[PDB]
Design a protein around this ligand. Structure first.
Ligand SMILES: *CCC(=O)N1CCN(c2nc(=O)n(-c3c(C)ccnc3C(C)C)c3nc(-c4c(O)cccc4F)c(F)cc23)[C@@H](C)C1
Ligand SMILES: Nc1nc2c(ncn2[C@@H]2O[C@H](COP(=O)(O)OP(=O)(O)O)[C@@H](O)[C@H]2O)c(=O)[nH]1
Ligand SMILES: [Mg+2]
Length: 167
């Protein structure tokens, strides 16, 4: 059989939410994707031998309340919290994104450090590890450019959802 998963990708503008999503959906790096496009995208994959259909909301709007988005997130099963390792402000926003999610919703999440290909690092892996530990969630390093960690990020989130469902 198969299992469907309703996922949401959040994080500051320009961290690579769309690039990550498109790597999952289409398996290549789309470097120019309209920063204002918010949509859900579906992709069939296989995770630990089970056919898995992922529906992924790639967030992009700036408003505090956006009806369709909020109804999606209210019923979202897991969230990727994405920052960029070269942008300290994106990492500082993570705890605010976590707060907003809890507000709309124990919720499966994965902390994602994207742009790991860039040498101009400003956020240390160890800081990201501290934060993920404080929430009791996984931390995964990614590059949407090279595709490093992309499956790890989404598949780890699915694995976190499986665990949550057992409870
Ligand atoms: C290039 C544009 C882009 O990618 N954006 C990403 C989404 N986005 C955004 N901005 C933002 O300030 N908030 C927000 C709001 C509206 C209120 C309080 N805090 C925040 C941030 C700092 C956490 C966004 N909030 C959400 C969000 C809401 O509103 C509710 C539940 C879960 C959420 F993640 C959101 F989806 C996007 C937010 C801007 C930067 C554009
Ligand atoms: N070098 C590098 N650039 C990236 C990566 N992910 C996204 N980008 C670039 O960062 C910018 C913002 O990406 P985008 O997916 O639009 O971010 P979003 O606003 O979170 O959707 C774009 O110019 C992308 O080409 C990455 O992993 N590495
Ligand atoms: Mg985008």
């Amino acid at each position: 059989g198969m299992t469907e998963y309703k996922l949401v990708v959040v994080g500051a503008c320009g961290v690579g939410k769309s690039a990550l999503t498109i790597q999952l959906i289409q398996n290549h790096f789309v470097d120019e994707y309209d920063p204002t496009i918010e949509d859900s995208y579906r992709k069939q994959v296989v995770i630990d031998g089970e056919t898995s259909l992922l529906d992924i909301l790639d967030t992009a709007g700036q408003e505090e309340y956006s009806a369709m988005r909020d109804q999606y997130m209210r019923t979202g099963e897991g969230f990727l919290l994405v920052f960029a390792i070269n942008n300290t402000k994106s990492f500082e926003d993570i705890h605010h994104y976590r707060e907003q999610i809890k507000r709309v919703k124990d919720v499966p999440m994965v902390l994602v450090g994207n742009k790991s290909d860039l040498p101009s690092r400003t956020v240390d892996t160890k800081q990201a590890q501290d934060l993920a530990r404080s929430y009791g969630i996984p931390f995964i390093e990614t590059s949407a450019k090279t595709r490093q960690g992309v499956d790890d990020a989404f598949y780890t989130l699915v694995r976190e959802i499986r665990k949550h469902k057992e409870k």
